[PDB]
Amino acid sequence: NLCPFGEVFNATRFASVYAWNRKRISNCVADYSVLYNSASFSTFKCYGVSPTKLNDLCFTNVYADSFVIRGDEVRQIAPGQTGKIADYNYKLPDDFTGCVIAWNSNNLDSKVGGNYNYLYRLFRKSNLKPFERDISTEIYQAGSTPCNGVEGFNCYFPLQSYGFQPTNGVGYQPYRVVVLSFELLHAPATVCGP
């Protein structure tokens, strides 16, 4: 009864970062050794758990949150960081326990002429809470004047699309990001490896 990591790290499609897709993992044996030694990941930055001794320790729930971001903002995915992604699309708590994996997917998601199917949020009234998911696509009000959902001055669509095309460098190349939050609670903690 292995944990279904293949369905997470090999999904055909990945949700946009503003609507990052969350999968709960519980009641399974997780072979984190394969994930750790796969050697196909650009970054494996883990906090609060040794990336070598992660197999031994078993937290109750495993939240695998997946999305896609451009490479230069991958550093933004970390506790205490700031930026457009860390303040409007997806933020991690300061005391976040768990690990993050990010690998290039330019040969997979980029399309000739520009893959414009991936969105991200630029505008919000207030910054996100930890693990906060804001998926409302309402018009944004920059001023104090209500404009009733009509595009114009101080009315901006909060979502912008990524221009993912194969001619882009590393900075603009898409990178698939999977963050594993290791949730500990007053529970039997039925999730560890071999």
Partner: antibody, heavy 123, light 107 residues
Framework: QVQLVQSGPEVKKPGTSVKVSCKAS????????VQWVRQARGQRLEWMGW????????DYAQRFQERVTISRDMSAGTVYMELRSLRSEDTAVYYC????????????????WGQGTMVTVSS | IVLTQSPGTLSLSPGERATLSCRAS???????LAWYQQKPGQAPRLLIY???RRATGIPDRFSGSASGTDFILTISRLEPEDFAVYYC?????????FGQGTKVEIK
């Protein structure tokens, strides 16, 4: 120093392209929208065209669509207007306007106005 | 939208009340138009936004009113520094055209 710094007066040859520069200072440039305005010496102001810096959305004039490209750069927090195929009539002042915009909210109008750039195009 | 300003030139003495009118070809929301002030020599400055609201730092003598297809700004007591040119600009429907200009000269 909330400033819209602009390049000094330019003397450009006809048929060339000039990059009119708009450097923002002391105000967050992610949320703000920048409009560009034009003024021939002694004439009125014609609205060059406006962009939203955060999302890159642009909108040009009905008569300047074919030689004007207004783009933004968050790395330096600047706005560039590319004026291609310059000609004699182009000698004018170019102004950058933008509402006072904080991290989340903006003013309901164009208040800040840069020093303006003189451009002279002739042989 | 075409914008017109009237009168073309405002021959007036300092100290009295002057009215500037702006006509929009169609009904334009009041909240999305402003008038600016330009003295030849520097950039035009914002005076009124939303067609009825006082901007920051401006003297209270300037004021704005009217609605729909007619917009008005009145200056209660005219000062020699007020003697400049005034422009309209709506920014509801693209293009955000400016007014032709409303110059005032001392009689």
């Amino acid at each position: 120093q909330v400033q819209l710094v602009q390049s000094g007066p330019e003397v450009k040859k006809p048929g060339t392209s000039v990059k009119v520069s708009c450097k923002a200072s002391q105000f967050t440039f992610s949320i703000s929208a920048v409009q560009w305005v034009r003024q021939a010496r002694g004439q009125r102001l014609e609205w060059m065209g406006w962009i939203v810096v955060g999302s890159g959305n642009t909108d040009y004039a009905q008569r300047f669509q074919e030689r004007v490209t207004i783009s933004r750069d968050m790395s330096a927090g600047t706005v560039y207007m590319e004026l291609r195929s310059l000609r004699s009539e182009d000698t004018a002042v170019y102004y950058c306007a933008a509402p006072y915009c904080n991290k989340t909210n903006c003013r309901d109008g164009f208040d800040m106005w840069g020093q303006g750039t003189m451009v002279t195009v002739s042989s | 939208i075409v914008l017109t300003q009237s009168p073309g030139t405002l021959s007036l003495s300092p100290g009295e009340r002057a009215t500037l009118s702006c006509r929009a070809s169609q009904s334009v929301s009041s909240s999305y138009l402003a008038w600016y002030q330009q003295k030849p020599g520097q950039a035009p400055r914002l005076l009124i936004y939303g067609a009825s609201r006082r901007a920051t730092g401006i003297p209270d003598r300037f004021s704005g009113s009217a609605s729909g297809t007619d917009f008005i700004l009145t200056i209660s007591r005219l000062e020699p520094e007020d003697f400049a040119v005034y422009y309209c600009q709506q920014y509801r429907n693209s293009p955000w055209t400016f007014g032709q200009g409303t110059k005032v000269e001392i009689k």
